[PDB]
Amino acid sequence: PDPCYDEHGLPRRCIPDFVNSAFGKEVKVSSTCGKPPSRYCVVTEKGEEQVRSCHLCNASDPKRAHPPSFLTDLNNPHNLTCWQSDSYVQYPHNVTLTLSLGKKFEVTYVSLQFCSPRPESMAIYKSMDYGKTWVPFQFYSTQCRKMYNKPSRAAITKQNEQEAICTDSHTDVRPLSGGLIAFSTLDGRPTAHDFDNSPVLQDWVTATDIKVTFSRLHTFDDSELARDSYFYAVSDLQVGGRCKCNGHASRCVRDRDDNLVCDCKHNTAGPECDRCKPFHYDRPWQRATAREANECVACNCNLHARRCRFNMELYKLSGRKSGGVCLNCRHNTAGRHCHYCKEGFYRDLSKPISHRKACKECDCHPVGAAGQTCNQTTGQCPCKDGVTGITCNRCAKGYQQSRSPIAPCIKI
Amino acid sequence: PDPCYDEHGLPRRCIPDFVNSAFGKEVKVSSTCGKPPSRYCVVTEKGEEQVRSCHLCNASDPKRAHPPSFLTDLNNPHNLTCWQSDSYVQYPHNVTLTLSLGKKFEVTYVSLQFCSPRPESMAIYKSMDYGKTWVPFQFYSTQCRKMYNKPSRAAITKQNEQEAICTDSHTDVRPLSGGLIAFSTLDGRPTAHDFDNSPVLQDWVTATDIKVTFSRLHTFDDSELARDSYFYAVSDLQVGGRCKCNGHASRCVRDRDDNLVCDCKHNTAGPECDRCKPFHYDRPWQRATAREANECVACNCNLHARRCRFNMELYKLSGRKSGGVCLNCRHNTAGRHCHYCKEGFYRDLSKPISHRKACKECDCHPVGAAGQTCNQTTGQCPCKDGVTGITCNRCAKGYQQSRSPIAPCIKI
Amino acid sequence: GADESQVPDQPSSLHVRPQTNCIIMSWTPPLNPNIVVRGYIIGYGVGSPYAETVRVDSKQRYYSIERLESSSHYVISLKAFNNAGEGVPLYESATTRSITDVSTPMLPPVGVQAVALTHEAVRVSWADNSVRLYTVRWRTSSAKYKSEDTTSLSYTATGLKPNTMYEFSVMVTKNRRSSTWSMTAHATTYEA
Amino acid sequence: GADESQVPDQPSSLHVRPQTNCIIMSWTPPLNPNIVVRGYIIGYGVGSPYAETVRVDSKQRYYSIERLESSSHYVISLKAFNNAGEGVPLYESATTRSITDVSTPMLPPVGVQAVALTHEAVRVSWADNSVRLYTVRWRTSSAKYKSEDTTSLSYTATGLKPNTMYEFSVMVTKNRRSSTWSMTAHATTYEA
Numbered sequence A, B: 001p002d003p004c005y006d007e008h009g010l011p012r013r014c015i016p017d018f019v020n021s022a023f024g025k026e027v028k029v030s031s032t033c034g035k036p037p038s039r040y041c042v043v044t045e046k047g048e049e050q051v052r053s054c055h056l057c058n059a060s061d062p063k064r065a066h067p068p069s070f071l072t073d074l075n076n077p078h079n080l081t082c083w084q085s086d087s088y089v090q091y092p093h094n095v096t097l098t099l100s101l102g103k104k105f106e107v108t109y110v111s112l113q114f115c116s117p118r119p120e121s122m123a124i125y126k127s128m129d130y131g132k133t134w135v136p137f138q139f140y141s142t143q144c145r146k147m148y149n150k151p152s153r154a155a156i157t158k159q160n161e162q163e164a165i166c167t168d169s170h171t172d173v174r175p176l177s178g179g180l181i182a183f184s185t186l187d188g189r190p191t192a193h194d195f196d197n198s199p200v201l202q203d204w205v206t207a208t209d210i211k212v213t214f215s216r217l218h219t220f221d222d223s224e225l226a227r228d229s230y231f232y233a234v235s236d237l238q239v240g241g242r243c244k245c246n247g248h249a250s251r252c253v254r255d256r257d258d259n260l261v262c263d264c265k266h267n268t269a270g271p272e273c274d275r276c277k278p279f280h281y282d283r284p285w286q287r288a289t290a291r292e293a294n295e296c297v298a299c300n301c302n303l304h305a306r307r308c309r310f311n312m313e314l315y316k317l318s319g320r321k322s323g324g325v326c327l328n329c330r331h332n333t334a335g336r337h338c339h340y341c342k343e344g345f346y347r348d349l350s351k352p353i354s355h356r357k358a359c360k361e362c363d364c365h366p367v368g369a370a371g372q373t374c375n376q377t378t379g380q381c382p383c384k385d386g387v388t389g390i391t392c393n394r395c396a397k398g399y400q401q402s403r404s405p406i407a408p409c410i411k412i
Numbered sequence C, D: 001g002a003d004e005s006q007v008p009d010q011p012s013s014l015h016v017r018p019q020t021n022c023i024i025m026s027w028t029p030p031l032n033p034n035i036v037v038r039g040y041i042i043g044y045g046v047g048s049p050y051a052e053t054v055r056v057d058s059k060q061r062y063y064s065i066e067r068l069e070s071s072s073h074y075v076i077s078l079k080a081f082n083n084a085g086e087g088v089p090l091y092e093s094a095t096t097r098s099i100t101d102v103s104t105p106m107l108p109p110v111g112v113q114a115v116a117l118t119h120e121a122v123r124v125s126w127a128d129n130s131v132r133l134y135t136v137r138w139r140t141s142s143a144k145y146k147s148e149d150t151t152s153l154s155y156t157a158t159g160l161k162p163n164t165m166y167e168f169s170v171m172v173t174k175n176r177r178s179s180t181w182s183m184t185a186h187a188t189t190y191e192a
């Protein structure tokens, strides 16, 4: 049953499942070892001394290959897979991971997990519009001012909740394998308990894309063994969070174009449920609140209008409830709701105002009538001085016709 | 049944069928190819380049011959025939087509249709009297002032509706084959909606003959291929319109002389029905109007006159209805209508005024009568002083004759 | 039709009835049935019949030339055709009516009076300010109408059940164009 | 379960009910029974599910995450595992309640009145200064109680032996948290 509506029939706020958005997806990487088969060296500590182990990275052989697929595959500790940058990727070399989500997700966290020692310098950026422009999410360094030009550990106020912080956290060369980096986009933001009511934070969390750049490795010499030991290895990459449906969907699916969109059930529309779906323009679109779900309401045209438009003046005028107005009413009816018959017509009354033929032709006599308009219901026409009837075709008792079309009836 | 008279017996205006007057007729041409068999070159455009095709014009061979017959024959698109002027007929060469209709037609339009590219300079003239003198109908040129000395596109006022206009219309070398020229004699004349009531326009339209002169071709070089490509070809020539019967015939036919004349049924006469037919001279001839057909009326002679003549003074005097007077009334009757017996005669009354012998001899006595004239009906004569009787041959009671022929009777 | 060796000879008749923006045309096949007729080429236009050309069915006796100008003299040509080609055309010409005629849509007659003559008869009269087929109708004042046409401004209704009030209306028709029902006059027939 | 060749597919459901300092979580096995499930790895923490990891029995459908912070957004992940290794996780997130909720322990309703309507009926009403499940109970004034729940601030007791004084009490429940029995009101039913 729909989680978007309650125990009986009422709209209630709905949120998609929290997922790791990275799980399926392919991630582009600046470099990967094995291209020509190369050598790497992983260092171990048994007791107090450093013990080097050497191994072959080979992209054609499946045991020795470390493709970026291995960034997002199923993460099995028992059997483990790592993507691996080549050797001597040290500063000022970058290694960049870049990932499209193809949809606006609200991201709660970003996780990397390293088969290698953690990098000493890394940066996490998001794209908020499908890859065109990036903003920083988080910065990790031992020297923040030096590397990223960011004073480290800036206190975050209400007036910057979107500021990218640089910090020394999770930079330790230990663990030398299996180490973690987990960015929490809501960590230490001031209004983060108010996220439902804070647009800036809701905005802060939204991303279509995630880019990770490794900047500096850890030292632990210039020899070739030393160089072959310097590289990046990540076993798993995760972007955790939800699909951004504005509280107006519990799911996201593919559409005709194989794009991912919210499956919007509020009478909502567009990929984020940012707007009302057509002929629902009675009230202006709202994001869903815990207290008040706000679904677009269908405006009433009584079957005589196939189109609709919102009017702010009307809204504000009508007590801040409704609303919209119907556009061009067919079947000889006149707006707002096409709730009556156009001037020049009258009511059938043997049908209600909704019916196709509920608008009956109001036929007034070209001569006998002073105008072309019926009384809406009674059927009357504006008869001239001495005329009478429904249409005005006959002179009243005591009267007879004249040769004058202007003054058709006279007394006697 | 006659279209010239209505549902029962009354004269109504009648108009001959609209026809292409050129269809039968032979048209004289200044030049035609093939005389000694010659060569022509027709140029084609496939895509952007010009492709020459050459062919033989041969007047003795029926496939290759292009006589002027082929100007007026049946125009079958599927099988097409063109008259063709010879080569290097370019300026200042003329090629002239001339056509007699042998009758006064009211021409609505004149059509030429070209197997060749349209000419850049052409002139249409009419003869209004059987070939003697020509006036211009229309002029086509790119340079009107240069070629025909006519400022192009002169606005036509009421005070020149007969002015021949020069214009650049239908001068395009495209189409390179099958192109049209259609002159409409009523086009842009001011009073052309009033044609029924405007004599100048009715006059403007009338022609016994049509002459077309081709003046300049299109350039598209001096080589002999170039020269052999320069010529005129017309597939069909049409003069559309009606036979001019003055509203007094629905047909035109041949007469004893094999001339074409209107088959005039209004009591009208002459080749255009311009006059009344003999002994119809009661009222003066009119052209037929939509509102009033005007047929010559027979004047009443009561069988005593074989000839008739109109009198304007009488017409104007008699209330502007009638009319004419009978000429020399036989059978002793006296005009206008021979409606009585001449002075010197009297009425039979046993016959009506129409009968041969309705005029009876009025015999007065050489002596007894003071004059030679009867009373018209009674039979009396102008008896002298003492005489009596119908003729006066006897002296009245109380009287007797004398020796005096002057005074024949005396009292006693 | 026996054979297609040659083109069709000309159509036997052509007649044209001009409307204001339109023209109606009718015709008949050639008199000689033996030559196959595969259809007709109509052609038309102002002052010459070259502006436009329509092709039709062999069984077509009728055509409506449908987008045209007021007060314009059109010339029309008609050809019959077959595989051999097209035969000699027949022409006619017509001048479309003026938009004046459709400008003011026709208005009913005014000053209408019905006076009872007898038990079976009532005299109806009207007026007109235009200086023409008038259609009079009558009914009981449920029961339905009775119609009559006149060329004049007064009619006399006969065959009426005595002592019964009737209802009379008139319309008018000009150049095949009609107004609506004029105002009604009520008259009661005489007791017989 | 037929075979352990591959890791378990994902759990079918996950649901979480946050307490103030605690969080309750429930789930269900994968839909495919054929792959042996040897237990689950729960993992959890603030903003990411990495702060802690618990391992449990294959037959476990339930877990209580028991030492946690007020007003904190925890993310929870759940994996099924076996000898092959661990399969793909399911997640959910929850925000623990505030210590405000346990600070002032819930207090009964006040201003309670019971007025006898009839021989079989008594109307009970109360008030609240908080600006919600109220539980009313009644008994004879030895003999024991009768309970009823309401969503409103007034209830009407039915089925009462006439001319008998009863005793009515109310408590209240907020966000699954309950006060004690409000002061009692004594009303005697009508003689029938």
Ligand SMILES: *[C@@H]1O[C@H](CO)[C@@H](O)[C@H](O)[C@H]1NC(C)=O
Residues within 6 Å of the ligand: A037, A058, A059, A060, A061, A062
């Ligand atoms: C890399 O792996 C492929 C595939 O097994 C193997 O054929 C190739 O020899 C390997 N390269 C080296 C340098 O051993």
Ligand SMILES: *[C@@H]1O[C@H](CO)[C@@H](O)[C@H](O)[C@H]1NC(C)=O
Residues within 6 Å of the ligand: A062, A063, A079, A080, A081
């Ligand atoms: C298990 O790990 C290997 C090597 O690390 C990797 O090639 C592969 O993805 C996994 N094998 C299976 C069963 O897919």
Ligand SMILES: *[C@@H]1O[C@H](CO)[C@@H](O)[C@H](O)[C@H]1NC(C)=O
Residues within 6 Å of the ligand: A092, A093, A094, A096, A213, A215
């Ligand atoms: C690469 O390294 C530079 C250091 O100068 C850094 O500023 C930049 O963001 C990194 N990423 C890319 C994509 O260049």
Ligand SMILES: *[C@@H]1O[C@H](CO)[C@@H](O)[C@H](O)[C@H]1NC(C)=O
Residues within 6 Å of the ligand: B037, B058, B059, B060, B061, B062
């Ligand atoms: C022209 O045609 C006639 C008749 O067919 C033919 O005899 C003659 O040879 C032709 N002329 C030329 C130059 O071919």
Ligand SMILES: *[C@@H]1O[C@H](CO)[C@@H](O)[C@H](O)[C@H]1NC(C)=O
Residues within 6 Å of the ligand: B062, B063, B079, B080, B081
């Ligand atoms: C058809 O066309 C030819 C050549 O163009 C011409 O000679 C002739 O008039 C037509 N043939 C017939 C069947 O008359």
Ligand SMILES: *[C@@H]1O[C@H](CO)[C@@H](O)[C@H](O)[C@H]1NC(C)=O
Residues within 6 Å of the ligand: B092, B093, B094, B096, B213, B215
């Ligand atoms: C021939 O060409 C001349 C150009 O000078 C033109 O004026 C004339 O009307 C044309 N026709 C005749 C028959 O000469």
Ligand SMILES: [Ca+2]
Residues within 6 Å of the ligand: A070, A071, A072, A073, A074, A075, A080, A081, A082, A235, A236
């Ligand atoms: Ca992996």
Ligand SMILES: [Ca+2]
Residues within 6 Å of the ligand: B070, B071, B072, B073, B074, B075, B080, B081, B082, B235, B236
């Ligand atoms: Ca021809």
